[PDB]
Every structure is written in C-alpha cells, then in structure tokens.
Write a protein that binds this DNA or RNA. Sequence first.
DNA 1: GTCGGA
Length: 226
Amino acid sequence: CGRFAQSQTREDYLALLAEDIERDIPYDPEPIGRYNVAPGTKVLLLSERDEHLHLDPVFWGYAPGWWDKPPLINARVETAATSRMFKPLWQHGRAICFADGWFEWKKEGDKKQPFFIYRADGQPIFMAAIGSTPFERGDEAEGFLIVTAAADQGLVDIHDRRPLVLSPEAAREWMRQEISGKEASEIAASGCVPANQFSWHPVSRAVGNVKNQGAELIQPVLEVLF
DNA sequence: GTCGGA
C-alpha cells in the first residue's frame, strides 16, 4: 500500500463520482501521467468542503511535530477511528485518493517481485484516505494517509495488507462533511471492495525506481526475465 | 498517539 498509479485525466476519475455542479475543480484535459506515485510526494487528493468536491495536491505522509519516526503513510482500518493519533483525521479529515491500481512487492526469496493490482471490471479505484485539514495549505509534514485493510482471498499471496478501496457510491458518502465518524466506520465496512474484484500481474522491476513514471510500468511481464 | 522499495 505504498505505491500506486494515477495516470489518467481528472475527468476519467471524477465522472464516476460527481457532475460539475458538485465540483469546485477546474477543467483540465491533461492526463495526470503518474504511473509511479510515491510517499512524500504531493498527490492530487479529493475531498469535500463548502459542499463541493475539491482536488488539492497533498503530501502523502503524516508526521506531527511530536512524531519522531519517518512519516506514516497508512492507517489501519481496524483501529484508525478510535486511535489517539488518527481519530480526529477519521472524523474531520476524510478524503479519497483515486488511482488506476496499486503496486505490491512479493517476496520471492531474497528478491522482491512487483505486481500491479487493479479492478477486473476496469474501473479506477477510490482509495479511502484520512489526513490533516486544511488540505489546501500544502503542508510538507502533515498530509494524508491511505487507509488499509487485511488482504483477502488471493491477494494474501502477494502481501498481508491492501488499501481500503471503496465503491464510487461509498467514496462519495465517505467524503461528506455531514456524516459522523461512526457513519464513516459503517461506510468503510459496507463500501469496501473485496479481493475477488481485483486482478493482478507481475510488472517490470523498473517501478522500484521513482524516476520512472511511464505507462510501461503497469504492463504484465514474465517473472523469468527479471 | 505506528506502519512500499529503487
């Protein structure tokens, strides 16, 4: 849950969530073009304020002033809503990070083989996020985290954790400022997309290097050639 | 106040 692709146009993602009347996001036809989004970079993050959807470049990571380790990048759904650290973000800082799919590395001895994981039905993914409002300040230490859940079904062959992916409908409800943390916990349970909805394949080891951002990084490869 | 790898 530490790398993903966000490569298509804003409309390609937003059209599944809300029409223009609900948005406060300028039209922009350029593909985002990032096939290898990494922690510590700013990522276009979707949230609701002033009864409209906003898209802000937000630091992927969370390190308050009292935190001494590298920034956290994930928050476990099992505990985030009641965590002393994450409860306020669960209440007030919910957001959505849309993506084409995400990457996980499978341990194969002393080597690690990357896989790209995506929806079999060809929709983008809407990953549940929590973070530090106001997002538009562009903070470089207190940004957002991707909420995670336990891997299910065949994904356990790759890694024991996965992002919490919500249906489009659930993603829209998750962002609403009017709903409580308890209601958000219900949405996170009812809207989670199960592992049987995902497909995956090995990809090139080149995704390990964040200099690489091109479309080839999500193409299937033979492991024997790596 | 906790959770990826070139």
